[PDB]
């Protein structure tokens, strides 16, 4: 009833009406895209998180929005955040924003790592849950493409949930190759080496590298490859990984990519134990297999789960897989934000009280 607002001060922190169902409100940070706040879900009498989304003005937010709604609505896993509610106007004409309701999670890996020091058992359990959730995503043929500590939510019992599927895509190996130094949108620091060389990021091994980066950050509380820019990122990787072999260079048919790599002075590998002196030797072995320069040699999710470091948790029949692979036609740098809006409206209909009143 609009008679519901929450200290805008900037962005869209003004109006924030979510009907009769969500009482007690409190802002939880925001952004120039949507505002976040906890609220009291009376029907369930529990506290949830509501994100205000205002995408119809920007077709890239509209595509990221529709995309995330369809996937998050199809997935059902303990380690992947889920949409519990979606609040919007009754008609397309009146729909300006959307409110996605999800479980309330106290913190995320990003903030935790900024203050806490994880124990090896905490590290193993967090890694276990990431891979468990990731095995489900990859089984549906979807790639997250933007995994990083801030995309991993934690509650007080150390339950982890993957969120943010705005950059997710269906796997496409046949259309992954591209030129050298191709623009990319995912977070620089967790970007696979092949992205700056000849990959579009349409492969599952792209996610494994990111999880590899996350493990290292957990082991030291510091990002392991913080390039300040595109190529700097790549030189951070080669500095620890050292110069790639011939066999690996032989896999780069891309001439511009290959010649740049050959133009570089030789660098020896820096052993992980010199980098993480108090790390569990098993964790470092796995860290090694994930942060493998060659995407074809990089370890698979299922393989990561069955690794000795995780034997305390590994249990195949307790690590579910998608019922049917995902798919959604439109995956293009374009689709009229006129068509998307009426598509978002339709995707969100199941949450309207038309089936209650």
Helix H, strand E, coil C: the string for 206-273 is HHHHHHHHHHHHHHHCCCCCCCCCHHHHHHHHHHHHCCCCHHHHCCCCCHHHHHHHHCCCCCCCCCHH
DSSP 279: S
The residue with tokens 């700056």 is: 196
The CA distance from 235 to 119, in Å, is: 30
68 touches Mg ion (CB under 5 A): no
153 touches ligand ATP (CB under 6 A): yes
Query: Using CB under 6 A, which of the segments 96-104, 203-211, 252-260, 337-345 binds ligand ATP?
Result: 96-104
217 touches Mg ion (CB under 5 A): no
104 touches ligand ATP (CB under 6 A): yes
118 touches ligand ATP (CB under 6 A): no
Going by C-alpha positions, the residue among 323, 282, 326, 325 that lies closest to residue 304 is: 282
Tokens matching residue 272: 């992980």
Residues 38-67 interacting with ligand ATP (rule: CB under 6 A):
49, 51
Q: Which does 102 bind (CB under 5 to 8 A by kind): ligand ATP, Mg ion, none?
A: ligand ATP
Q: Does an H or E element contain 153, and which? A: strand 152-154
Whether 174 sits among the annotated catalytic residues: the reply is: no
Query: Using CB under 5 A, which of the segments 41-49, 128-136, 146-154, 193-201 binds Mg ion?
Result: 146-154
Size of the site for Mg ion (CB under 5 A): 2
Going by C-alpha positions, the residue among 74, 102, 120 that lies closest to residue 18 is: 102
Going by C-alpha positions, the residue among 57, 40, 295 that lies closest to residue 192 is: 295
Q: Which of 41, 146, 164, 207 is catalytic?
A: 146
- The gap from C-alpha 169 to its chain's centroid, in whole angstroms, comes to 11
Residue from 31, 90, 308, 336 in contact with ligand ATP (CB under 6 A): 31
Query: Using CB under 5 A, which of the segments 33-41, 162-170, 212-220, 295-303 binds Mg ion?
Result: 162-170
* Shortest Å distance, C-beta 296 to ligand ATP: 30
Q: Which does 83 bind (CB under 5 to 8 A by kind): ligand ATP, Mg ion, none?
A: none
* Shortest Å distance, C-beta 104 to ligand ATP: 5
CA-based Rg of the chain, rounded to a whole angstrom? 22
4 touches ligand ATP (CB under 6 A): no
Any bridge partners for residue 36, and if so which? Answer: 51
Q: Which does 170 bind (CB under 5 to 8 A by kind): ligand ATP, Mg ion, none?
A: none
Going by C-alpha positions, the residue among 90, 105, 91, 86 that lies closest to residue 22 is: 86
* Shortest Å distance, C-beta 309 to Mg ion: 27
144 touches ligand ATP (CB under 6 A): no
Residue nearest to Mg ion (CB): 164
List residues with catalytic annotation. Answer: 146
Residues that bind ligand ATP (CB under 6 A): 28-29, 31, 36, 49, 51, 102-105, 108, 150, 153, 164
């Amino acid at each position: 009833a609009a008679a519901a607002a929450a200290g805008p001060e900037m962005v869209r922190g003004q109006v924030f009406d979510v009907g009769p169902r969500y009482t007690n409100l409190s802002y939880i940070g925001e952004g120039a895209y949507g505002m976040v706040c906890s609220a009291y879900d009376n029907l369930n009498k529990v506290r949830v998180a509501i994100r205000k989304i205002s995408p119809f003005e920007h077709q890239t937010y509209c595509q990221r929005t529709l995309r995330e709604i369809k996937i998050l609505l199809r997935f059902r896993h303990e380690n992947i955040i889920g949409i519990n509610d979606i609040i919007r106007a009754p008609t397309i004409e009146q729909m300006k924003d959307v409110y996605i309701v999800q479980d309330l999670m106290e913190t995320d890996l990003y903030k935790l790592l900024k203050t806490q020091h994880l124990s090896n058992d905490h590290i193993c359990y967090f890694l276990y849950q990431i891979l468990r959730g990731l095995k489900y995503i990859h089984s549906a043929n979807v790639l997250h493409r933007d995994l990083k500590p801030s995309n991993l939510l934690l509650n007080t019992t150390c339950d982890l949930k993957i969120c943010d599927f705005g950059l997710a895509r269906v796997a496409d190996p046949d259309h992954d190759h591209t030129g050298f130094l191709t623009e990319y949108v995912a977070t620089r620091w967790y970007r696979a080496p092949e992205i700056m060389l000849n990959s579009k990021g349409y492969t599952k091994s792209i996610d494994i590298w990111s999880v590899g980066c996350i493990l290292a950050e957990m082991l030291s509380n510091r990002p392991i490859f913080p390039g300040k820019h595109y190529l700097d990122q790549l030189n951070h990787i080669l500095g620890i990984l050292g110069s790639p072999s011939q066999e690996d260079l032989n896999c780069i048919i891309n001439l511009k990519a290959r010649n740049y790599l050959l133009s570089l002075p030789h660098k020896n590998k820096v052993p992980w134990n010199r980098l993480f002196p108090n790390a569990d030797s098993k964790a470092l072995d796995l860290l090694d297999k994930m942060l493998t320069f060659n995407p074809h040699k990089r370890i698979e999710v299922e393989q990561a789960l069955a690794h000795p470091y995780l034997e305390q948790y590994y249990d195949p029949s307790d690590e579910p897989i998608a019922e049917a692979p995902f798919k959604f036609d439109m995956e293009l740098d374009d689709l009229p934000k006129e068509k998307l809006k009426e598509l978002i409206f339709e995707e969100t209909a199941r949450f309207q009280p038309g089936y209650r009143s």
